[PDB]
Amino acid sequence: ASYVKFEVPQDLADKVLEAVRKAKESGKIKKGTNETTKAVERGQAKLVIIAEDVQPEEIVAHLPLLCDEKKIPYVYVSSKKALGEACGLQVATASAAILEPGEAKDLVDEIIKRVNEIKGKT
Amino acid sequence: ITVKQTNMENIYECEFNDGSFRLCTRNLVPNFNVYGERLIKYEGVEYREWNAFRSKLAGAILKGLKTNPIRKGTKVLYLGAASGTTISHVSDIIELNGKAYGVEFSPRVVRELLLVAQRRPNIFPLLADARFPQSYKSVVENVDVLYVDIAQPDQTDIAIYNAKFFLKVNGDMLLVIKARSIDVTKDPKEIYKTEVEKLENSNFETIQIINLDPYDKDHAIVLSKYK
Amino acid sequence: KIYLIEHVIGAVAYDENGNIVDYITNPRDLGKITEELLNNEKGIPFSATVELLKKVNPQEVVVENEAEVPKLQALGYRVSYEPYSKVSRIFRESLPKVAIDIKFASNEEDYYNFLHELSLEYTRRKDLLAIQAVRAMDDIDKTINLFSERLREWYSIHFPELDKLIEDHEEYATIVSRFGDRGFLTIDSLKELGFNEQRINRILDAAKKSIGADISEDDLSAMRMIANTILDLYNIRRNLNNYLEGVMKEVAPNVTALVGPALGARLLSIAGSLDELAKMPASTIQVLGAEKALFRALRSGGRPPKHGIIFQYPAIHTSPRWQRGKIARALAAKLAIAARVDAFSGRFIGDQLNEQLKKRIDEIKEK
Amino acid sequence: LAIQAVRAMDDIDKTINLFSERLREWYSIHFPELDKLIEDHEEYATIVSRFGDRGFLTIDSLKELGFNEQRINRILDAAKKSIGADISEDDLSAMRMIANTILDLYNIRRNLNNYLEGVMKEVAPNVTALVGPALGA
């Protein structure tokens, strides 16, 4: 896909899906592309999760651009069905956001730092 | 409110209604702003507020950049002009005398650079790839400053290549080192050391190395002199 | 050995020392320089260069660019290239100056004025009109209505009964325009508009028994000026709709597929650009326009608008009040997707989007 | 009729201004520098109406409406060094429809004023003596 900026190894992708689930339980998440958009526009989100198999690619293509303006970090997962079913839904989701990590703070902070390393930085 | 000169030409600070201090430049095209920035009148002269969070040059200043080689009537080659945020400020600094050649290879973005450069006689936009200076050889001259902010793994090499084309001997190069776009895996601090060595192993004389933190994560800027 | 330079300034020959042996100045013409620079990319030498390599007759020449070499060998010379040569630098070190020396410009002042506009034009070569046009269309719409309301009030001094007899503004205007006095109406001139047998008769009888005012030709032509302006504006409108359709299909085909040219453009005009429209969530796109309504609800926690400029979509304003909310939400949802495929380059997928939408609408209506 | 006429005049006034405001915003995509150079709406419109593209502008054709020596030069220089957009003939004529409408309204306005003056002197001469036809009406 062409809206995918960098490469996410599956160990990370799994640690992402985990971080989200704990965030449903103990914190606050947002699920769905439109609700994710508002979360970035409003600067509430700490981490934005985007799926790699969205089926018109362009549906989530605006998120990388939006996230960089508001300087909120984003990450990819391979399956949309997997992210939605993480989210506490029985249907797919193309993107989600974590607003308050709760009992995933440590888990999230490691993710937003690993995606920094495999992006450039130091 | 109060506006006053700083150690560096055509760069000013404001005392504010509340007591904050923000950088600004003298507005070359009064009544008109390039991004959303605040326009400020003081003693009948208009200044553009220079947000450090957007412009790596302002960032470098606020992180104590010794001496700024961009001044009144300076000739600058600006690799990675992007949308025109920073280059508009070096337009202001340089004034009608000096000139700024803005190299940028992304059309989606040069789109908005056009609008900036229309209003500004200082700025000579170029939709070209900075890896081939041959493809803008025919428009530019030699220059005092090579300001380089390009997202590329071999960004340092690219910069050097342009330097031996267009950078006057004893001219200055401001090189933005983007760690996470050279290698996301490596430590930003290892990268800064190795890229500065490339400049030294050519013949650039490192003058100052700044870390752009608060303002830019995993970035550093190098000021050095070409020989 | 001659080192050869190519620039906007022209073509210069230099020796190994860095002295101008000979030069040929370019014409100060935006069109021709731009084309030769574009051409030089492919290896094609300037025509000023061709002439220069004739004046001097050099055995070994060396150029700046590696793509030129085989072109100049085909022209008869033995040629090589040096990348960041001492000579190419020596040339550029004195480039503010040597523009005057080889008389490309009289002074520095308009060497740069020219160079600026070359760079502008050279990059130009390598949605805002959609917005302006629809804005002007909404101005014309507004004016047509203002003038037509004025005209009816005005012309009704002479022939008051005609007002309630002609619903359509364009028709009304055509009457005041073509006839003038009420006693100048005629059957065939009216058959020509499209008026059915029966209506012609009602109009004519209305004019005969009219309790309107007898009035001078000065007075009537005064009214007729407005009538002709109304008619003009209707043509200009239709012309602008077609122009708009052309641009809108070009700039935002997916959005156009969904809501038509006008309403798509209208949405661009409120958003500011296509790239701004794309970045919007549907819940914004659904209420664009209607800002007075929105911020009233946001300030007080009352009921929000169901629809903004989207109300204009046939499916909405024709539908009953309780269906409108759902049709709006569904449209806005698809519009956001449409905007994003349009903005981020994607080729037309408006057909399945329409189909998806009409499905959702058909379900809504079956309740 | 005096009343109706002035009411339409006021509508026309209003519209001239709306269109001229639009035209300048629109036409400035192509030739932005012309907006602050021509104060007068009627003049501005005459230029877009007669020319469209800024490379169609000539000392000759501009003298042929009475623009003064020095101003013609500033216009042409501004058109030469313009940072505007290069744009199709379809785009320009779209704009020129508005310009011609503006020009049409100015003529209609001047005609309405003379008509208004005629009626106003007839119907209320003393009032018209004081404040003019328009304001009287």
**Helices C217-251 and D89-123: crossing angle, nearest 10°?**
160
Nearest to D115 among C129, C133, C218 (CB): C218
Q: How far apart, in Å, are the Cα atoms of C265 and each of C125, C278, D35?
A: 26, 13, 25
Residues of D in contact with C236 (CB under 8 A): 97-98, 101
Among C42, C31, C298, residue whose Cα is nearest residue D55: C31
Read off the tokens for C89.
């630098």
Among A68, C82, C230, D39, residue whose Cα is nearest residue B54: A68
Side-chain-side CA neighbours of C188 within 13 Å: the count stands at 0
Look at strands B123-127 and B167-178 and give their pairing.
unpaired
**D129: how many CB neighbours lie within 10 A of its CB?**
10
Q: What are the DSSP calls for C133-179, one per residue?
A: HHHHHHHHHHHHHHHHHHHHHHHTTT-GGGTTT---HHHHHHHHHHT
Which three-class secondary structure state does DSSP give residue C292?
helix
Among C116, C279, C199, C360, residue whose Cα is nearest residue B102: C116
Angle at B188 between CA B182 and CA B194, to 5 degrees: 70
**Residue that is written with structure tokens 């929000």 in the block:** C304
Among B136, B125, B147, B151, residue whose Cα is nearest residue B71: B147
Q: Is D131 on the interface with C (CB under 8 A)?
A: no
Whether C281 sits inside 8 A of A35 (CB atoms) is yes
Taking the C-alpha atoms of residue B41 and residue C136, their distance in angstroms, rounded to an integer, is 35
Q: Which residue of D has its CA nearest to C241?
A: D94
CA A30 vs. chain centroid, Å, equals 10
Q: How far apart, in Å, are the Cα atoms of C304 and each of A102, B135, C280, C320, D98?
A: 32, 55, 18, 18, 37
Phi then psi dihedrals of residue C165, to 5 deg? -90, -20
Whether C123 sits inside 8 A of B135 (CB atoms) is no
Residues of B in contact with D32 (CB under 8 A): 118
The letter for the amino acid at C323 is: Q
Read off the tokens for B193.
């050391």
Among C107, A18, C180, residue whose Cα is nearest residue C115: C107
Side-chain-side CA neighbours of C162 within 13 Å: the count stands at 29
Q: What are the DSSP calls for B91-152, one per residue?
A: HHHHTTTSEEEEEE--HHHHHHHHHHHHS-TTEEEEE--TT-GGGTTTT---EEEEEE----
CA D67 vs. chain centroid, Å, equals 15
Which three-class secondary structure state does DSSP give residue B185?
coil
Taking the C-alpha atoms of residue B193 and residue A70, their distance in angstroms, rounded to an integer, is 30
Counting beta carbons within 10 angstroms of the beta carbon of residue C231, is it exposed (0 to 12), middle (13 to 18) or buried (19 or more)?
middle
DSSP β-bridge partners for residue B4 = B13
The answer to whether A43 and A77 are in contact (CB under 8 A) is no
Strands (E), chain C: 2-7, 10-14, 20-25, 60-63, 78-81
Q: Which residue of B has its CA nearest to C116?
A: B124
CA C58 vs. chain centroid, Å, equals 52
Taking the C-alpha atoms of residue C151 and residue C226, their distance in angstroms, rounded to an integer, is 7
Q: Is B227 on the interface with C (CB under 8 A)?
A: no
Counted residue by residue, chain D has a size of: 137
Query: D interface mutation test: which of B96, B114, B118 has the most D CBs within 10 A?
Result: B118
Enter the DSSP assignment of D34. Answer: G
Read off the tokens for B162.
């342009």
Which three-class secondary structure state does DSSP give residue C329?
helix
The answer to whether D118 and D131 are in contact (CB under 8 A) is no
The number of C-beta contacts closer than 8 angstroms across B and D is 6
Whether C92 sits inside 8 A of B142 (CB atoms) is yes
Query: C interface mutation test: which of A2, A5, A30, A34 has the most C CBs within 10 A?
Result: A34
Angle at A44 between CA A42 and CA A50, to 5 degrees: 95
Which three-class secondary structure state does DSSP give residue C5?
strand
Q: Is C239 on the interface with D (CB under 8 A)?
A: yes
Q: Break chain C down into helix, strand, coil percent, rounded to 5.
A: 65, 5, 30
Q: How far apart, in Å, are the Cα atoms of B217 and each of B56, B80, B103, C141, C358?
A: 11, 18, 24, 52, 48
- How close B218 comes to chain C (CA, Å)? 27
Q: What are the DSSP calls for C11-35, one per residue?
A: EEEE-SSS-EEEEEEPPS-HHHHHH
Q: Is D55 on the interface with C (CB under 8 A)?
A: no
Taking the C-alpha atoms of residue B158 and residue B154, their distance in angstroms, rounded to an integer, is 6
- How close D25 comes to chain B (CA, Å)? 15
Whether C95 sits inside 8 A of B141 (CB atoms) is yes
Taking the C-alpha atoms of residue C42 and residue A100, their distance in angstroms, rounded to an integer, is 55
Q: Is D32 on the interface with B (CB under 8 A)?
A: yes
Nearest to D11 among C147, C215, C218 (CB): C147
The letter for the amino acid at D5 is: A
Which three-class secondary structure state does DSSP give residue B12?
strand
Taking the C-alpha atoms of residue C71 and residue C39, their distance in angstroms, rounded to an integer, is 12
Residues 131-190 of B with CB under 8 A from D: none
Enter the DSSP assignment of A32. Answer: S
Q: How far apart, in Å, are the Cα atoms of C262 and each of A67, C267, C281, C310, C313?
A: 31, 9, 21, 11, 10
**Residue that is written with structure tokens 């004519």 in the block:** C204
Taking the C-alpha atoms of residue B219 and residue B151, their distance in angstroms, rounded to an integer, is 11
Region of B31 please: left (phi>0), alpha (psi -120 to 50) or beta. left
The answer to whether C115 and C103 are in contact (CB under 8 A) is no
Q: Is D1 on the interface with C (CB under 8 A)?
A: yes
Resolution in A: 7.3
User: Which secondary-structure segment (H or E) carries C343?
Assistant: helix C321-343
Non-local (6+) Cβ contacts of D134 within 8 A are D6, D9, D113, D116
- How close B85 comes to chain D (CA, Å)? 19
Phi then psi dihedrals of residue C289, to 5 deg? 80, -160
Region of B170 please: left (phi>0), alpha (psi -120 to 50) or beta. left
DSSP β-bridge partners for residue A96 = A31, A49
Residues 59-98 of D with CB under 8 A from B: 83-84
Cα-based torsion angle of the residue sequence C305, C307, C312, C314 in order, rounded to the nearest 10 degrees: -120
Read off the tokens for B29.
């095209």
**C166: how many CB neighbours lie within 10 A of its CB?**
18
Q: How far apart, in Å, are the Cα atoms of D91 and each of A49, B44, B130, B160, C279?
A: 43, 40, 34, 45, 27
Q: Count the helices and strands in chain A (H runs, E runs).
A: 5, 4
**C141: how many CB neighbours lie within 10 A of its CB?**
13
Among D104, D72, D93, D87, residue whose Cα is nearest residue D32: D87
Among A58, A112, A51, A56, residue whose Cα is nearest residue A84: A51
User: For chain D, how big is the Rg over CA atoms in Å?
Assistant: 18
Q: Which residue of A has its CA nearest to C278?
A: A62
Which three-class secondary structure state does DSSP give residue D21?
helix
**C186: how many CB neighbours lie within 10 A of its CB?**
13
User: Which secondary-structure segment (H or E) carries B176?
Assistant: strand B167-178
**3-state secondary structure string across D75-134:** HHHHHHCCCCCCCCHHHHHHHHHHHHHHHHHHHHHHHHHHHHHHHHHHHCHHHHHHHCHH
The number of C-beta contacts closer than 8 angstroms across A and B is 43
- How close B122 comes to chain C (CA, Å)? 8
Whether A119 sits inside 8 A of B184 (CB atoms) is yes
Return the biggest CA–CA distance within chain C: 103
Cα-based torsion angle of the residue sequence B180, B184, B187, B190 in order, rounded to the nearest 10 degrees: -70
Non-local (6+) Cβ contacts of C39 within 8 A are none
Q: Which residue of C has its CA nearest to A66?
A: C279
Counting beta carbons within 10 angstroms of the beta carbon of residue D9, is it exposed (0 to 12), middle (13 to 18) or buried (19 or more)?
buried
Side-chain-side CA neighbours of C2 within 13 Å: the count stands at 22
Q: How far apart, in Å, are the Cα atoms of C81 and each of B14, B137, B142, C51?
A: 53, 14, 20, 19
The answer to whether C6 and C79 are in contact (CB under 8 A) is no
Look at strands A28-31 and A95-100 and give their pairing.
antiparallel
Q: How far apart, in Å, are the Cα atoms of C170 and each of C136, C144, C149, C212?
A: 19, 9, 12, 22
Read off the tokens for C228.
């002709």
Nearest to D11 among C117, C146, C218 (CB): C146
* Subunit partners of chain C (3 or more CB pairs within 8 A): A, B, D
Nearest to C41 among B114, B135, B140 (CB): B135
The letter for the amino acid at C25 is: T
Cα-based torsion angle of the residue sequence C39, B137, B146, B172 in order, rounded to the nearest 10 degrees: 180
Taking the C-alpha atoms of residue C41 and residue C74, their distance in angstroms, rounded to an integer, is 17
- How close B190 comes to chain C (CA, Å)? 31
Q: Do the two chains A and D touch, given a threshold of 8 Å on CB pairs and at least 3 pairs?
A: no
Whether B138 sits inside 8 A of C122 (CB atoms) is no
Q: Is B118 on the interface with D (CB under 8 A)?
A: yes
Q: Is C244 on the interface with A (CB under 8 A)?
A: no
Nearest to D94 among C229, C233, C240 (CB): C240
Residues of D in contact with C240 (CB under 8 A): 94, 97
Experimental approach taken? cryo-EM
**D128: how many CB neighbours lie within 10 A of its CB?**
21
Q: Which residue of C has its CA nearest to B122?
A: C116
* Subunit partners of chain D (3 or more CB pairs within 8 A): B, C
The answer to whether C223 and C151 are in contact (CB under 8 A) is yes
Cα-based torsion angle of the residue sequence B178, B183, B189, B193 in order, rounded to the nearest 10 degrees: -80
Counted residue by residue, chain A has a size of: 122
Which three-class secondary structure state does DSSP give residue A77?
strand
User: Which secondary-structure segment (H or E) carries B211?
Assistant: strand B204-211
**Residue that is written with structure tokens 């160079």 in the block:** C115
Counting beta carbons within 10 angstroms of the beta carbon of residue C237, is it exposed (0 to 12), middle (13 to 18) or buried (19 or more)?
middle
**Residue that is written with structure tokens 């995918």 in the block:** A4
Residues of D in contact with B114 (CB under 8 A): 83
Angle at D110 between CA D104 and CA D111, to 5 degrees: 90
Q: What are the DSSP calls for B13-81, one per residue?
A: EEE-SSS-EEEEEE-SSTT--SSSPPEEEETTEEEEE--TTT-HHHHHHHTT-S--S--TT-EEEEE--
DSSP β-bridge partners for residue B166 = none
Whether A34 sits inside 8 A of C343 (CB atoms) is no
Residues of C in contact with A42 (CB under 8 A): none
User: Which secondary-structure segment (H or E) carries B219?
Assistant: strand B219-226
Return the biggest CA–CA distance within chain D: 56
Residues of B in contact with D84 (CB under 8 A): 118
CA C25 vs. chain centroid, Å, equals 39
User: Which secondary-structure segment (H or E) carries B164?
Assistant: helix B155-166
Look at strands A95-100 and B2-5 and give their pairing.
unpaired
**B15: how many CB neighbours lie within 10 A of its CB?**
13
Q: How far apart, in Å, are the Cα atoms of B51 and each of B14, B83, C75, C310?
A: 12, 15, 55, 37
